[PDB]
């Protein structure tokens, strides 16, 4: 893992593994700054396809295609934790990927993620591994009711989790563990969730975006408010500083946190990428999480601080939100609508987002509650 | 007037940096983009769903663009008035032809600006050799003689011959040479239903006739007067989308309309980082029939510098050290000393200090 790495000048080519909306927004920043973009994704309808100079259609495990990507690019970054750590290690060894493979390897798997966090001395939710039927006996013992079982590999947006309140829930849990190795952790009484988006670049440079406050609905990110209405910035940074001694990050990554009914901070999970809770920074900050991602990865200097120019309330737009709202869009320029361009609408698929700049966050928050039902 | 929803297709005539920045907003907002341009190296090419490579006069390519698109816009004055008129009548082109047509002819520009009641620089037509006489009577020294079509100072007697030489086969328009204290521009967007939204007044400095520096907020208080002029212009000339009016302020503080661009303009690029909406975001809204915001907010003051080829030659090796320059590099492959290759927008809480830093920084390139 190089502390110092290639400084790439405009005109160089950036490779992106993954063409979802995160890749798309990375590629829009990259093209604005004068970098060329090659993007790799299995789907020919991927949102990033028409903001790339070149599109390589292939699966994320496809070694020939990943090598072709490396042959075309001066730096390679990734948009989602999809890829196998083993494939990515091979690629880091042959091409320029300052992000390395450690972040991905370790954060792919919930157990390894939890272990690392505890071992870095961060405040983690008490946790235990459960791959078998009997290991749940240990979880009832070692954590107590309530507690929650999560798949350790597949999970995104609330999927692959079973909340276990009483023993009349164990039935639904066994049904998940019989199909996938899992982890269990205490179910907390959470009053707020926050996250801290960060960028790390050349020669140990680091920058922090404003702390963001996150409400979920059906375990999917629903609403992000910035600045977070609870003061946890300093404690959040302390945890990041611990995390950074144990896992190599370059470019943007995001740490999600829980705060107790008793105002206690725990690290929940880390995304080694730009993150849904950072999208607001496009309109609200003097740099977005994608701008700094490109700066970092191409080995440029990072700004020392990020300014929030105006506070903001960002709403995700799932397919069902479009069903409800799309006919109102045209009368609401203050929604700053982002529509990713995905061709197949589904009720829970993230189809876009909206960012409402506001001087009165609490009011705007009300406005949005009424709007989303 | 077609109100278009995300998933509709927007055609852009011209694929330079202006069309590129339109396409990026369009794609951000979920519109598809088709771009037409004669160069395969055009900067807009790889932010478009489709690319049509053709001259702006190629009637069949234009028809192909029309057939593929739900609305068409132009990024620049690249197409002829009569040809655009035909296109406007067959396809959905909200910007119309009226503004383009008027502007390809300095005398009718001048005369309809005068008809409209705006403060235009006093001018006269110089058709014949005998007319310069009529000019030196009404305007006097100094005045300047410009070609009526397409697109030559006269201080005294000695420049007279050089001017008689242009009037000789090439009909002209003559105008007072003012002593210019400041230049400013007002970028505006006009949408469906008479909605009109103003960007912060911009103060512009040119060097060698190319835009050099734009400062916002303009350091001369002419907002209200500039707005009054735009409101008058809007009565005689049809705009939809973003357009820009450039003004002169003379040494006695008199405001004059200089020229109009019926499209996003170089002096508005700072709005990408400095305002809540950019001039490209509001152009896409206007053109697709969406509501416009009622005001544009300046979130932080900005000094924007153009990056010509000679400025890249000077400065490119220090870009890495200055994230606070917010570099845009258009991606044109052939660098030329005077060609616009990019720009930089410096957000700042002290424009005067930043302006001095920029003068020092750009000094080695002129
Ligand atoms: N231990 C817990 N206690 C209380 N709520 C939790 C806990 N773990 C998860 N949740 C709720 O579920 C949401 C999603 O959990 P997470 O592990 O981040 O899943 P994913 O990776 O799929 O987003 C969290 O934002 C939180 O609101
Ligand atoms: N009356 C005038 N007094 C002084 N300069 C003038 C006058 N009229 C035109 N000019 C010159 O011509 C230029 C305006 O036309 P042009 O450069 O084509 O448009 P733009 O304002 O976009 O640069 C100015 O740079 C100015 O030097
Ligand atoms: Mg989560
Ligand atoms: Mg000028």
Short mmCIF file of N, CA and C in Angstrom, two decimals, chain B residues 177-337:
data_model
loop_
_atom_site.label_atom_id
_atom_site.label_comp_id
_atom_site.label_asym_id
_atom_site.label_seq_id
_atom_site.Cartn_x
_atom_site.Cartn_y
_atom_site.Cartn_z
N UNK B 177 -16.65 55.38 -30.37
CA UNK B 177 -15.67 54.69 -29.56
C UNK B 177 -15.73 55.27 -28.15
N UNK B 178 -16.21 54.48 -27.20
CA UNK B 178 -16.38 54.99 -25.84
C UNK B 178 -15.11 54.78 -25.07
N UNK B 179 -14.93 55.60 -24.05
CA UNK B 179 -13.95 55.33 -23.01
C UNK B 179 -14.61 54.41 -21.96
N UNK B 180 -14.30 53.12 -22.03
CA UNK B 180 -14.88 52.07 -21.16
C UNK B 180 -14.19 51.96 -19.79
N UNK B 181 -14.93 52.24 -18.74
CA UNK B 181 -14.50 52.08 -17.36
C UNK B 181 -14.67 50.62 -16.91
N UNK B 182 -15.80 50.00 -17.23
CA UNK B 182 -16.08 48.60 -16.80
C UNK B 182 -16.93 47.89 -17.85
N UNK B 183 -16.87 46.55 -17.84
CA UNK B 183 -17.78 45.76 -18.60
C UNK B 183 -18.53 44.79 -17.69
N UNK B 184 -19.82 44.63 -17.92
CA UNK B 184 -20.58 43.71 -17.12
C UNK B 184 -21.50 42.89 -18.01
N UNK B 185 -21.96 41.74 -17.50
CA UNK B 185 -22.91 40.93 -18.25
C UNK B 185 -24.01 40.48 -17.32
N UNK B 186 -25.20 40.28 -17.85
CA UNK B 186 -26.28 39.74 -17.04
C UNK B 186 -26.69 38.46 -17.73
N UNK B 187 -26.55 37.35 -17.04
CA UNK B 187 -27.00 36.06 -17.58
C UNK B 187 -28.42 35.83 -17.11
N UNK B 188 -29.27 35.40 -18.01
CA UNK B 188 -30.70 35.30 -17.73
C UNK B 188 -31.22 34.03 -18.32
N UNK B 189 -32.26 33.46 -17.69
CA UNK B 189 -33.01 32.37 -18.28
C UNK B 189 -34.49 32.69 -18.40
N UNK B 190 -35.05 32.41 -19.58
CA UNK B 190 -36.45 32.69 -19.81
C UNK B 190 -37.15 31.40 -20.16
N UNK B 191 -38.29 31.12 -19.54
CA UNK B 191 -38.93 29.81 -19.72
C UNK B 191 -40.36 29.91 -20.23
N UNK B 192 -41.07 28.79 -20.20
CA UNK B 192 -42.51 28.76 -20.46
C UNK B 192 -43.25 29.76 -19.57
N UNK B 193 -44.33 30.34 -20.09
CA UNK B 193 -45.18 31.22 -19.30
C UNK B 193 -44.55 32.52 -18.80
N UNK B 194 -43.66 33.11 -19.59
CA UNK B 194 -43.04 34.38 -19.17
C UNK B 194 -42.16 34.35 -17.90
N UNK B 195 -41.82 33.17 -17.42
CA UNK B 195 -40.91 33.11 -16.30
C UNK B 195 -39.51 33.60 -16.72
N UNK B 196 -38.93 34.48 -15.91
CA UNK B 196 -37.64 35.11 -16.15
C UNK B 196 -36.85 35.09 -14.84
N UNK B 197 -35.63 34.56 -14.89
CA UNK B 197 -34.83 34.45 -13.69
C UNK B 197 -33.43 35.04 -13.96
N UNK B 198 -32.95 35.88 -13.04
CA UNK B 198 -31.67 36.56 -13.26
C UNK B 198 -30.53 35.97 -12.43
N UNK B 199 -29.38 35.80 -13.04
CA UNK B 199 -28.16 35.40 -12.31
C UNK B 199 -27.55 36.67 -11.78
N UNK B 200 -26.64 36.56 -10.80
CA UNK B 200 -25.91 37.75 -10.29
C UNK B 200 -25.16 38.47 -11.42
N UNK B 201 -25.19 39.79 -11.40
CA UNK B 201 -24.48 40.60 -12.36
C UNK B 201 -23.01 40.28 -12.31
N UNK B 202 -22.42 40.12 -13.51
CA UNK B 202 -21.03 39.67 -13.67
C UNK B 202 -20.14 40.82 -14.18
N UNK B 203 -18.95 40.99 -13.61
CA UNK B 203 -17.98 41.97 -14.11
C UNK B 203 -16.88 41.28 -14.95
N UNK B 204 -16.76 41.66 -16.21
CA UNK B 204 -15.88 40.96 -17.14
C UNK B 204 -14.68 41.77 -17.57
N UNK B 205 -13.51 41.14 -17.59
CA UNK B 205 -12.31 41.77 -18.17
C UNK B 205 -11.85 40.97 -19.38
N UNK B 206 -11.65 41.65 -20.51
CA UNK B 206 -11.14 41.02 -21.75
C UNK B 206 -9.69 41.40 -21.95
N UNK B 207 -8.93 40.53 -22.61
CA UNK B 207 -7.55 40.78 -23.02
C UNK B 207 -7.44 40.27 -24.44
N UNK B 208 -6.91 41.08 -25.36
CA UNK B 208 -6.82 40.65 -26.75
C UNK B 208 -8.17 40.22 -27.30
N UNK B 209 -9.24 40.86 -26.83
CA UNK B 209 -10.61 40.56 -27.30
C UNK B 209 -11.15 39.18 -26.89
N UNK B 210 -10.49 38.54 -25.92
CA UNK B 210 -10.96 37.26 -25.42
C UNK B 210 -11.27 37.44 -23.93
N UNK B 211 -12.36 36.85 -23.47
CA UNK B 211 -12.72 36.95 -22.04
C UNK B 211 -11.54 36.37 -21.22
N UNK B 212 -11.11 37.14 -20.21
CA UNK B 212 -9.96 36.82 -19.38
C UNK B 212 -10.40 36.46 -17.95
N UNK B 213 -11.16 37.37 -17.33
CA UNK B 213 -11.54 37.24 -15.95
C UNK B 213 -12.98 37.68 -15.79
N UNK B 214 -13.76 36.92 -15.02
CA UNK B 214 -15.11 37.31 -14.60
C UNK B 214 -15.22 37.31 -13.08
N UNK B 215 -15.69 38.40 -12.50
CA UNK B 215 -15.82 38.54 -11.04
C UNK B 215 -17.27 38.69 -10.65
N UNK B 216 -17.69 37.93 -9.65
CA UNK B 216 -19.04 38.02 -9.12
C UNK B 216 -18.93 38.12 -7.59
N UNK B 217 -19.56 39.12 -6.99
CA UNK B 217 -20.53 40.07 -7.57
C UNK B 217 -19.83 41.20 -8.28
N UNK B 218 -20.41 41.69 -9.38
CA UNK B 218 -19.80 42.80 -10.09
C UNK B 218 -19.52 43.95 -9.10
N UNK B 219 -18.38 44.63 -9.28
CA UNK B 219 -17.96 45.65 -8.31
C UNK B 219 -18.46 47.03 -8.72
N UNK B 220 -19.48 47.03 -9.58
CA UNK B 220 -20.18 48.24 -9.97
C UNK B 220 -21.68 47.99 -9.93
N UNK B 221 -22.41 48.85 -9.22
CA UNK B 221 -23.83 48.64 -8.97
C UNK B 221 -24.78 49.05 -10.12
N UNK B 222 -24.97 48.16 -11.07
CA UNK B 222 -25.75 48.45 -12.24
C UNK B 222 -26.86 47.41 -12.43
N UNK B 223 -27.09 46.58 -11.41
CA UNK B 223 -28.04 45.48 -11.51
C UNK B 223 -29.43 45.92 -11.99
N UNK B 224 -30.00 46.89 -11.29
CA UNK B 224 -31.34 47.36 -11.58
C UNK B 224 -31.43 47.92 -13.00
N UNK B 225 -30.52 48.84 -13.36
CA UNK B 225 -30.46 49.36 -14.73
C UNK B 225 -30.25 48.28 -15.79
N UNK B 226 -29.30 47.35 -15.57
CA UNK B 226 -29.14 46.21 -16.49
C UNK B 226 -30.42 45.40 -16.65
N UNK B 227 -31.07 45.06 -15.54
CA UNK B 227 -32.35 44.36 -15.60
C UNK B 227 -33.41 45.08 -16.43
N UNK B 228 -33.53 46.40 -16.23
CA UNK B 228 -34.47 47.23 -17.02
C UNK B 228 -34.22 47.11 -18.52
N UNK B 229 -32.95 47.03 -18.90
CA UNK B 229 -32.62 46.92 -20.31
C UNK B 229 -33.00 45.52 -20.83
N UNK B 230 -32.67 44.48 -20.07
CA UNK B 230 -33.00 43.14 -20.47
C UNK B 230 -34.52 43.04 -20.63
N UNK B 231 -35.27 43.57 -19.65
CA UNK B 231 -36.74 43.56 -19.73
C UNK B 231 -37.29 44.23 -20.99
N UNK B 232 -36.55 45.21 -21.53
CA UNK B 232 -36.96 45.89 -22.76
C UNK B 232 -36.62 45.04 -23.98
N UNK B 233 -35.43 44.45 -23.94
CA UNK B 233 -34.97 43.57 -25.01
C UNK B 233 -35.90 42.38 -25.18
N UNK B 234 -36.36 41.86 -24.06
CA UNK B 234 -37.23 40.70 -24.02
C UNK B 234 -38.56 41.00 -24.74
N UNK B 235 -38.99 42.26 -24.77
CA UNK B 235 -40.21 42.65 -25.51
C UNK B 235 -40.06 42.55 -27.01
N UNK B 236 -38.85 42.76 -27.53
CA UNK B 236 -38.67 42.73 -28.99
C UNK B 236 -38.07 41.44 -29.52
N UNK B 237 -37.41 40.67 -28.65
CA UNK B 237 -36.68 39.49 -29.05
C UNK B 237 -37.06 38.31 -28.17
N UNK B 238 -37.40 37.22 -28.84
CA UNK B 238 -37.86 35.99 -28.23
C UNK B 238 -36.66 35.18 -27.72
N UNK B 239 -36.65 34.92 -26.42
CA UNK B 239 -35.70 33.95 -25.86
C UNK B 239 -36.42 32.87 -25.07
N UNK B 240 -35.92 31.64 -25.17
CA UNK B 240 -36.20 30.59 -24.19
C UNK B 240 -34.88 29.90 -23.81
N UNK B 241 -34.72 29.56 -22.55
CA UNK B 241 -33.42 29.11 -22.11
C UNK B 241 -32.56 30.30 -21.67
N UNK B 242 -31.26 30.04 -21.51
CA UNK B 242 -30.36 31.01 -20.91
C UNK B 242 -29.77 31.84 -22.02
N UNK B 243 -29.60 33.12 -21.75
CA UNK B 243 -28.99 34.01 -22.71
C UNK B 243 -28.31 35.07 -21.91
N UNK B 244 -27.46 35.85 -22.58
CA UNK B 244 -26.57 36.75 -21.86
C UNK B 244 -26.54 38.05 -22.59
N UNK B 245 -26.69 39.13 -21.84
CA UNK B 245 -26.52 40.45 -22.39
C UNK B 245 -25.28 41.12 -21.78
N UNK B 246 -24.38 41.56 -22.65
CA UNK B 246 -23.15 42.23 -22.28
C UNK B 246 -23.33 43.74 -22.40
N UNK B 247 -22.83 44.49 -21.42
CA UNK B 247 -22.98 45.92 -21.35
C UNK B 247 -21.60 46.60 -21.24
N UNK B 248 -21.54 47.87 -21.62
CA UNK B 248 -20.38 48.72 -21.42
C UNK B 248 -20.76 49.72 -20.38
N UNK B 249 -19.83 50.05 -19.49
CA UNK B 249 -20.03 51.22 -18.66
C UNK B 249 -18.93 52.21 -18.99
N UNK B 250 -19.32 53.42 -19.42
CA UNK B 250 -18.31 54.41 -19.80
C UNK B 250 -17.79 55.18 -18.60
N UNK B 251 -16.76 56.02 -18.80
CA UNK B 251 -16.10 56.73 -17.71
C UNK B 251 -17.00 57.70 -16.99
N UNK B 252 -18.12 58.07 -17.61
CA UNK B 252 -19.15 58.87 -16.93
C UNK B 252 -20.27 58.06 -16.32
N UNK B 253 -20.07 56.74 -16.26
CA UNK B 253 -21.00 55.82 -15.62
C UNK B 253 -22.27 55.51 -16.42
N UNK B 254 -22.26 55.82 -17.70
CA UNK B 254 -23.43 55.53 -18.53
C UNK B 254 -23.37 54.09 -18.99
N UNK B 255 -24.48 53.38 -18.86
CA UNK B 255 -24.61 51.99 -19.27
C UNK B 255 -25.05 51.87 -20.74
N UNK B 256 -24.42 51.00 -21.51
CA UNK B 256 -24.89 50.74 -22.86
C UNK B 256 -25.01 49.24 -23.10
N UNK B 257 -25.98 48.84 -23.91
CA UNK B 257 -26.04 47.46 -24.33
C UNK B 257 -24.95 47.27 -25.35
N UNK B 258 -24.12 46.25 -25.16
CA UNK B 258 -23.09 45.92 -26.12
C UNK B 258 -23.56 44.84 -27.11
N UNK B 259 -23.74 43.60 -26.64
CA UNK B 259 -24.22 42.56 -27.52
C UNK B 259 -24.96 41.48 -26.76
N UNK B 260 -25.73 40.68 -27.48
CA UNK B 260 -26.53 39.65 -26.88
C UNK B 260 -26.06 38.31 -27.39
N UNK B 261 -25.98 37.34 -26.50
CA UNK B 261 -25.80 35.99 -26.92
C UNK B 261 -27.05 35.23 -26.49
N UNK B 262 -27.75 34.64 -27.46
CA UNK B 262 -28.97 33.86 -27.25
C UNK B 262 -28.67 32.43 -26.79
N UNK B 263 -27.82 32.27 -25.76
CA UNK B 263 -27.35 30.94 -25.36
C UNK B 263 -26.49 31.14 -24.11
N UNK B 264 -26.20 30.05 -23.36
CA UNK B 264 -25.21 30.12 -22.28
C UNK B 264 -23.92 30.77 -22.77
N UNK B 265 -23.25 31.52 -21.90
CA UNK B 265 -22.16 32.38 -22.30
C UNK B 265 -20.97 32.21 -21.35
N UNK B 266 -19.77 32.40 -21.89
CA UNK B 266 -18.50 32.16 -21.15
C UNK B 266 -18.50 32.85 -19.79
N UNK B 267 -19.19 33.99 -19.70
CA UNK B 267 -19.14 34.82 -18.45
C UNK B 267 -20.04 34.23 -17.35
N UNK B 268 -20.77 33.16 -17.67
CA UNK B 268 -21.64 32.52 -16.66
C UNK B 268 -21.14 31.19 -16.08
N UNK B 269 -19.97 30.70 -16.49
CA UNK B 269 -19.53 29.36 -16.07
C UNK B 269 -19.25 29.31 -14.57
N UNK B 270 -18.93 30.45 -13.95
CA UNK B 270 -18.68 30.48 -12.52
C UNK B 270 -19.92 29.92 -11.73
N UNK B 271 -21.11 30.01 -12.34
CA UNK B 271 -22.36 29.66 -11.62
C UNK B 271 -22.40 28.19 -11.33
N UNK B 272 -21.58 27.41 -12.01
CA UNK B 272 -21.55 25.98 -11.71
C UNK B 272 -21.15 25.75 -10.25
N UNK B 273 -20.09 26.42 -9.79
CA UNK B 273 -19.69 26.22 -8.40
C UNK B 273 -20.29 27.25 -7.44
N UNK B 274 -20.62 28.45 -7.92
CA UNK B 274 -20.86 29.54 -6.99
C UNK B 274 -22.32 29.75 -6.65
N UNK B 275 -23.23 29.27 -7.50
CA UNK B 275 -24.69 29.53 -7.30
C UNK B 275 -25.39 28.24 -7.00
N UNK B 276 -26.65 28.35 -6.61
CA UNK B 276 -27.47 27.17 -6.34
C UNK B 276 -27.91 26.44 -7.60
N UNK B 277 -27.96 27.16 -8.72
CA UNK B 277 -28.29 26.61 -10.05
C UNK B 277 -27.22 27.13 -10.98
N UNK B 278 -26.82 26.34 -11.97
CA UNK B 278 -25.90 26.87 -13.00
C UNK B 278 -26.72 27.32 -14.23
N UNK B 279 -26.06 28.03 -15.14
CA UNK B 279 -26.73 28.63 -16.28
C UNK B 279 -27.11 27.51 -17.25
N UNK B 280 -26.42 26.37 -17.13
CA UNK B 280 -26.76 25.18 -17.91
C UNK B 280 -27.94 24.43 -17.30
N UNK B 281 -27.97 24.30 -15.95
CA UNK B 281 -29.13 23.69 -15.31
C UNK B 281 -30.42 24.42 -15.67
N UNK B 282 -30.42 25.75 -15.55
CA UNK B 282 -31.65 26.49 -15.85
C UNK B 282 -31.95 26.45 -17.37
N UNK B 283 -30.93 26.36 -18.22
CA UNK B 283 -31.19 26.25 -19.67
C UNK B 283 -31.98 24.97 -20.01
N UNK B 284 -31.59 23.85 -19.40
CA UNK B 284 -32.25 22.57 -19.61
C UNK B 284 -33.71 22.58 -19.08
N UNK B 285 -33.91 23.10 -17.87
CA UNK B 285 -35.24 23.35 -17.34
C UNK B 285 -36.11 24.15 -18.29
N UNK B 286 -35.61 25.30 -18.72
CA UNK B 286 -36.39 26.22 -19.55
C UNK B 286 -36.80 25.51 -20.82
N UNK B 287 -35.79 24.97 -21.49
CA UNK B 287 -35.94 24.33 -22.79
C UNK B 287 -36.87 23.08 -22.76
N UNK B 288 -36.90 22.34 -21.63
CA UNK B 288 -37.79 21.17 -21.50
C UNK B 288 -39.19 21.58 -20.96
N UNK B 289 -39.43 22.87 -20.79
CA UNK B 289 -40.72 23.33 -20.32
C UNK B 289 -41.02 23.23 -18.85
N UNK B 290 -39.99 23.07 -18.01
CA UNK B 290 -40.14 22.97 -16.57
C UNK B 290 -40.23 24.37 -15.95
N UNK B 291 -40.72 24.46 -14.72
CA UNK B 291 -40.67 25.74 -14.01
C UNK B 291 -39.22 26.11 -13.67
N UNK B 292 -38.91 27.40 -13.74
CA UNK B 292 -37.61 27.95 -13.33
C UNK B 292 -37.61 28.41 -11.85
N UNK B 293 -36.45 28.39 -11.18
CA UNK B 293 -36.49 29.00 -9.86
C UNK B 293 -36.76 30.51 -9.97
N UNK B 294 -37.33 31.10 -8.92
CA UNK B 294 -37.69 32.53 -8.92
C UNK B 294 -36.48 33.44 -8.75
N UNK B 295 -35.43 32.92 -8.12
CA UNK B 295 -34.20 33.68 -8.02
C UNK B 295 -32.98 32.76 -8.02
N UNK B 296 -31.86 33.31 -8.41
CA UNK B 296 -30.62 32.60 -8.29
C UNK B 296 -29.89 33.19 -7.11
N UNK B 297 -29.38 32.32 -6.27
CA UNK B 297 -28.64 32.73 -5.10
C UNK B 297 -27.12 32.58 -5.39
N UNK B 298 -26.34 33.61 -5.06
CA UNK B 298 -24.88 33.53 -5.04
C UNK B 298 -24.43 32.96 -3.71
N UNK B 299 -24.04 31.69 -3.70
CA UNK B 299 -23.67 31.04 -2.44
C UNK B 299 -22.30 31.48 -1.90
N UNK B 300 -21.37 31.79 -2.81
CA UNK B 300 -20.09 32.31 -2.46
C UNK B 300 -19.53 33.10 -3.64
N UNK B 301 -18.87 34.26 -3.38
CA UNK B 301 -18.29 35.02 -4.49
C UNK B 301 -17.22 34.22 -5.21
N UNK B 302 -16.99 34.55 -6.48
CA UNK B 302 -16.10 33.78 -7.35
C UNK B 302 -15.26 34.70 -8.24
N UNK B 303 -14.03 34.30 -8.52
CA UNK B 303 -13.27 34.90 -9.61
C UNK B 303 -13.04 33.77 -10.60
N UNK B 304 -13.53 33.90 -11.82
CA UNK B 304 -13.31 32.87 -12.81
C UNK B 304 -12.30 33.33 -13.85
N UNK B 305 -11.34 32.45 -14.20
CA UNK B 305 -10.34 32.74 -15.21
C UNK B 305 -10.50 31.74 -16.35
N UNK B 306 -10.47 32.25 -17.58
CA UNK B 306 -10.37 31.37 -18.73
C UNK B 306 -8.99 30.70 -18.78
N UNK B 307 -8.94 29.50 -19.34
CA UNK B 307 -7.67 28.86 -19.59
C UNK B 307 -7.45 28.71 -21.09
N UNK B 308 -6.70 29.62 -21.67
CA UNK B 308 -6.31 29.49 -23.06
C UNK B 308 -5.16 28.51 -23.13
N UNK B 309 -4.77 28.13 -24.35
CA UNK B 309 -3.63 27.24 -24.55
C UNK B 309 -2.38 27.79 -23.89
N UNK B 310 -2.12 29.10 -24.08
CA UNK B 310 -0.92 29.75 -23.47
C UNK B 310 -0.97 29.77 -21.97
N UNK B 311 -2.18 29.78 -21.38
CA UNK B 311 -2.31 29.65 -19.93
C UNK B 311 -2.02 28.19 -19.44
N UNK B 312 -2.46 27.17 -20.18
CA UNK B 312 -2.05 25.81 -19.86
C UNK B 312 -0.53 25.70 -19.93
N UNK B 313 0.08 26.18 -21.00
CA UNK B 313 1.53 26.15 -21.13
C UNK B 313 2.19 26.74 -19.87
N UNK B 314 1.58 27.78 -19.34
CA UNK B 314 2.19 28.45 -18.20
C UNK B 314 1.95 27.71 -16.90
N UNK B 315 0.70 27.25 -16.68
CA UNK B 315 0.23 26.90 -15.36
C UNK B 315 -0.05 25.40 -15.13
N UNK B 316 -0.11 24.59 -16.19
CA UNK B 316 -0.65 23.23 -15.99
C UNK B 316 0.14 22.42 -14.95
N UNK B 317 1.43 22.67 -14.86
CA UNK B 317 2.25 21.94 -13.86
C UNK B 317 1.98 22.27 -12.39
N UNK B 318 1.29 23.36 -12.10
CA UNK B 318 0.86 23.58 -10.74
C UNK B 318 -0.60 23.29 -10.40
N UNK B 319 -1.39 22.72 -11.33
CA UNK B 319 -2.82 22.45 -11.06
C UNK B 319 -3.01 21.50 -9.90
N UNK B 320 -2.13 20.52 -9.83
CA UNK B 320 -2.18 19.49 -8.79
C UNK B 320 -2.13 20.07 -7.35
N UNK B 321 -1.56 21.25 -7.20
CA UNK B 321 -1.33 21.83 -5.89
C UNK B 321 -2.50 22.71 -5.47
N UNK B 322 -3.45 22.93 -6.39
CA UNK B 322 -4.54 23.88 -6.11
C UNK B 322 -5.93 23.33 -6.36
N UNK B 323 -6.45 22.54 -5.42
CA UNK B 323 -7.83 22.10 -5.57
C UNK B 323 -8.79 23.29 -5.55
N UNK B 324 -8.42 24.34 -4.82
CA UNK B 324 -9.31 25.52 -4.73
C UNK B 324 -9.41 26.29 -6.08
N UNK B 325 -8.74 25.81 -7.13
CA UNK B 325 -8.98 26.36 -8.47
C UNK B 325 -10.19 25.77 -9.24
N UNK B 326 -10.73 24.63 -8.78
CA UNK B 326 -11.91 24.02 -9.40
C UNK B 326 -11.76 23.99 -10.93
N UNK B 327 -10.74 23.29 -11.40
CA UNK B 327 -10.42 23.24 -12.82
C UNK B 327 -11.46 22.50 -13.64
N UNK B 328 -11.87 23.12 -14.75
CA UNK B 328 -12.63 22.44 -15.84
C UNK B 328 -11.68 22.36 -17.03
N UNK B 329 -11.45 21.18 -17.57
CA UNK B 329 -10.59 21.07 -18.74
C UNK B 329 -11.47 20.43 -19.78
N UNK B 330 -11.68 21.12 -20.90
CA UNK B 330 -12.75 20.71 -21.82
C UNK B 330 -12.46 19.41 -22.52
N UNK B 331 -11.18 19.07 -22.67
CA UNK B 331 -10.77 17.82 -23.30
C UNK B 331 -10.48 17.93 -24.77
N UNK B 332 -10.20 19.15 -25.26
CA UNK B 332 -9.86 19.34 -26.67
C UNK B 332 -8.42 18.87 -26.90
N UNK B 333 -8.18 18.10 -27.95
CA UNK B 333 -6.83 17.48 -28.07
C UNK B 333 -5.75 18.40 -28.68
N UNK B 334 -6.17 19.34 -29.51
CA UNK B 334 -5.23 20.21 -30.19
C UNK B 334 -5.14 21.56 -29.45
N UNK B 335 -4.08 21.73 -28.65
CA UNK B 335 -3.86 22.97 -27.92
C UNK B 335 -3.37 24.08 -28.85
N UNK B 336 -3.93 25.28 -28.72
CA UNK B 336 -3.46 26.45 -29.49
C UNK B 336 -3.36 27.60 -28.51
N UNK B 337 -2.39 28.48 -28.71
CA UNK B 337 -2.13 29.54 -27.75
C UNK B 337 -3.38 30.32 -27.33
#
